[PDB]
A paper describes a structure:
Intracellular ADPR targets and activates the nonselective, calcium-permeable TRPM2 channel in the presence of Ca2+. Belonging to the transient receptor potential melastatin family (TRPM), TRPM2 shares a characteristic MHR1-4 domain, a transmembrane domain (TMD), and a coiled-coil domain with the other family members. It is unique due to owning a characteristic C-terminal NUDT9-H domain, which has been considered a classic binding site for ADPR and its derivatives, but the presence of the ADPR binding site has not been directly observed. In summary, our human TRPM2 structures defined two distinctive ADPR binding sites, one in the MHR1/2 domain and one in the NUDT9-H domain.
In both ADPR-bound structures, ADPR densities were observed in two different sites on each subunit, one (ADPR1) in the cleft of the MHR1/2 domain and a second (ADPR2) in the cleft of the NUDT9-H domain. Relative to the apo state, the binding of ADPR to hsTRPM2 yielded a markedly elevated MHR1/2 layer and a contracted NUDT9-H layer, with the NUDT9-H domain swinging toward the pore axis. Therefore, ADPR1 is bent into a compact U shape to adapt to the MHR1/2 site, similar to the finding in the drTRPM2 structure. ADPR1 is clamped between Y295 and the loop connecting the β5 strand α3 helix (β5-α3 loop), with the terminal adenine and terminal ribose moieties close to each other. In contrast, the cleft in the NUDT9-H domain is wider, embraced by its cap and core regions on each side and the central β sheet on the bottom, allowing ADPR2 to nestle in an extended shape with the terminal adenine and terminal ribose moieties far apart. The adenine moiety of ADPR2 stacks between Y1485 and D1431, while the α-phosphate group interacts with R1433. ADPR binding into the cleft of MHR1/2 led to a clamshell closure similar to that observed in the drTRPM2 structures. Binding of ADPR into the cleft of the NUDT9-H induced a rigid-body rotation of the core region toward the cap region, resulting in a bi-lobed domain closure. Within the TMD specifically, although the pore domain showed little change, the S1-S4 domain underwent a remarkable clockwise rotation around the pore axis. Because ADPR alone cannot active the TRPM2 channel in the absence of Ca2+, we designated the ADPR-hsTRPM2 structure as a ADPR-bound non-activated state.
Numbering used by the authors:
A (entry chain B): 528 to 582, 613 to 980, 1020 to 1099, 1104 to 1150
B (entry chain A): 884 to 980, 1020 to 1061
């Protein structure tokens, strides 16, 4: 009862409302209760582990050992769970599940000693999962590739990699083989090695792909040339879809700029409706991004997660600004404001071009850096603002008499304040100018020196792993995104809408495998586990404190 | 050969002017033989690599702000050499560093994103590309 999990279980069980009739007041403890607190600790995406009965000799579950490991891990029993993990079923999912549960618990720990050990144990389990995975990958590559995409029926019908992404398993995803898997699924059907410029070259030319100017793995396509199927597999690769999408985006913004510049006119031209319908197709694709999830999570949680997306938040802000400016252009009396409102719309699109350099080798880290630095840029902006308006109202008050000029005094005062801030009257003039060079030209720049040296030096190392971690989700999106450009995404949109009107993830990310194949796979990894363990304890014997004890 | 063309005497001459610039950078080749300065040549040779890809992003930011500034405070005119040159001059004057509310909004955005952020990006990037190499360069 000293642990945090007992208090959380008691707070659930006391708030359990559906137990009306019994001899006592405190009804019972059922397994669906601890399943319910486990689901809220673990995340929304999994199913409930234990089912609720809709109502023998010995009732036996799918596996006892997982629940035993859960019982051991919620109470921070270290050496016990270290023992019983050796008899696991599929240890790679198991150590991930325990590290995620430990990380989700240790943040809410509210104790200055339990949180630290709770974190360190999760780090050790990360190391265990890494160590078994680097063994089984080194045994055979392509078979171990199948291990990640496999759904585990044990852990509530999920696969391990989305669980690791949920756990922020930063040391785990940074392994070479998993990144190679990501690169393999990123480069689509063809071979991986073509570089970047040759992709653009075959992007420019249609019949080059039918000729002998490009690579293919899966040599049936490389030897037997079916150029319809070859072009189909070529367009199926998400690099191609990404490049055509960014090209269509570039053409869309350029034509939007030209039509906004010279073709503004009160009657509707054809071009304004053209860019309007381009944006309309774009926001239908963005709505499709909201309405996909076959994992039946919270629709409120789905909209919160998509609203938690920074780029999606900027996108819907630009949509709201566009639909404000469109009805201001609809008013014939507000033509000059509404037009320049759309000008801001162009700015709210070009910031989307900062979305590119995540795919760069090096620049993505700097995007992470400026995303960090914005957080105190904001609350420094507030203080510089109140300082400069204090100096401005002082400058307005000193060298004039009291006049009620609403547009004469305020505008000239704001112009003088901006001229100051863009960087016998002799004694008072020297005092004003020396104060101006004193507080403005020195202090707050040094505040930014200290604050930004701090917010740089606090993070100037591990960001490469953060970029490697952040690599996944865009590949996830573009595998999910269809292959048509936003001028032609409507053909897919109508087909998907009528398909869901009259009536599923891809198999390359999640698949119910064959059971006898899965048993062979499980026996293989469970054979490799003991091979890991022997050398593990052998090298752990070689620490000098152990030899001192011996 | 531009000086060879008698009709292109003013461009070709100033082309050779750039030639003089392309020779004086060769004088940076000297201070490798210095005791101490050669390391700093190595340092700037390191720093050019992200100077380039920062230059791209500052360029697209300033041209976005420039086309915004062109679009806001004028009517639609087809001036090819009148509007574009004055717009580029106003953008360079900005980047070298009841209209009251809109003027305060434009000037506060100008002091907001330009006068703060990208300099701090260079602070972080160049503190990083300095501190990653600030030791073994003598060897």
């Amino acid at each position: 009862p000293s642990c945090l999990f007992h208090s959380k279980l008691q707070k659930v069980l006391v708030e359990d409302p559906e137990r009306p009739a019994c001899a006592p007041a405190a009804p019972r403890l059922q397994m669906h209760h601890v399943a319910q607190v486990l689901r809220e600790l673990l995340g929304d995406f999994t199913q409930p582990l234990y089912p609720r009965p809709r109502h023998g000799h010995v009732t036996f579950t799918m596996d006892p050992i997982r629940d035993l490991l859960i019982w051991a891990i919620v109470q921070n029993r270290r050496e016990l769970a270290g023992i019983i993990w050796a008899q696991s079923q599929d240890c790679i999912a198991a150590a991930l599940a325990c590290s995620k549960i430990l990380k989700e618990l240790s943040k809410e720990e509210e104790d200055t000693d339990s949180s630290e050990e709770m974190l360190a144990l999760a780090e050790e389990y990360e190391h265990r999962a890494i160590g078994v995975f680097t063994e089984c990958y080194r045994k055979d590559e392509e078979r171990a590739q199948k291990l990640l995409t496999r759904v585990s029926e044990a852990w509530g019908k999920t696969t391990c990699l989305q669980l690791a992404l949920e756990a922020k398993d930063m040391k785990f995803v940074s392994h070479g083989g998993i990144q190679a898997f990501l690169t393999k699924v990123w480069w689509g059907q063809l071979s991986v090695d073509n570089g970047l410029w040759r992709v653009t070259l075959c992007m420019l030319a249609f019949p080059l792909l039918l000729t002998g100017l490009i690579s293919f793995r899966e040599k049936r396509l490389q030897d037997v040339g079916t150029p319809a199927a070859r072009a189909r597999a070529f367009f199926t690769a998400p690099v191609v879809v990404f490049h055509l999408n960014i090209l269509s985006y570039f053409a869309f913004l350029c034509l939007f700029a030209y039509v906004l510049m010279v073709d503004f006119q009160p009657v509707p031209s054809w071009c304004e409706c053209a860019i309007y319908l381009w944006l309309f197709s774009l926001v239908c694709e963005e709505m499709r991004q909201l309405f996909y999830d076959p994992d039946e999570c919270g629709l409120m949680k789905k909209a919160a997660l998509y609203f938690s997306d920074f780029w999606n938040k900027l996108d819907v802000g630009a949509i709201l600004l566009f639909v404000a400016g469109l009805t201001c252009r609809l008013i014939p009396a507000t033509l000059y404001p509404g037009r320049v409102i759309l000008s801001l719309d162009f700015i709210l699109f070009c910031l989307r071009l900062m979305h590119i350099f995540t795919i760069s080798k090096t620049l993505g880290p700097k995007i992470i850096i400026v995303k960090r630095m914005m957080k105190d840029v904001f609350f420094f902006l507030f203080l510089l603002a109140v300082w400069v308006v204090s100096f401005g109202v002082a400058k307005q008050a000193i060298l004039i008499h009291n006049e009620r000029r609403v547009d004469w005094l305020f505008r000239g005062a704001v112009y003088h304040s901006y001229l100051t801030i863009f960087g016998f009257p002799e004694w008072l003039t020297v005092l004003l100018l020396c104060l101006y060079l004193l507080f403005t030209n020195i202090l707050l720049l040094n505040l930014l020196i200290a604050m930004f040296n701090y917010t740089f030096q606090q993070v100037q190392e591990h960001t490469d792993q953060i970029w490697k971690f952040q690599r996944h989700d865009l590949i996830e999106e573009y595998h999910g995104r269809p292959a048509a450009p936003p001028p032609f995404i409507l053909l897919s949109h109508l087909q998907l809408f009528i398909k869901r009107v009259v009536l599923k993830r891809h198999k390359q990310l999640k698949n119910k495998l064959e059971k006898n194949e899965e048993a062979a796979l499980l026996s293989w990894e469970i054979y490799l586990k003991e091979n890991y363990l022997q050398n593990r304890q052998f090298q752990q014997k070689q620490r000098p404190e152990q030899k001192i004890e011996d």
